[PDB]
Amino acid sequence: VHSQRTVKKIRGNLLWYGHQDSPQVRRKLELEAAVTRLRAEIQELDQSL
């Protein structure tokens, strides 16, 4: 049993971070980073060409 502010704190912390730490958010972010790495590779390979 806690205070109301502490319970809202813990509930908001979990319900926001677990939304942020979901593996679906992580896989979307790494696919966006993969797109970034891929057109960076496009630029570098075209520069070498």
Binding site: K28, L31, E32, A34, V35, L38, E41, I42, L45, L49
Partner: protein, 50 residues
Amino acid sequence: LEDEVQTLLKLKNLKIQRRNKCQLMASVTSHKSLRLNAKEEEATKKLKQS
């Protein structure tokens, strides 16, 4: 997003499959240029000895 990733991946696959081709093309161009440079020497020796 995966479609975009694989299209860029096959783009770079064809880029490598033309990269080795470009290595071959630089090779044959360099050989033909050195061939012409070696063709210069008959012209020089025929200009000198004759």
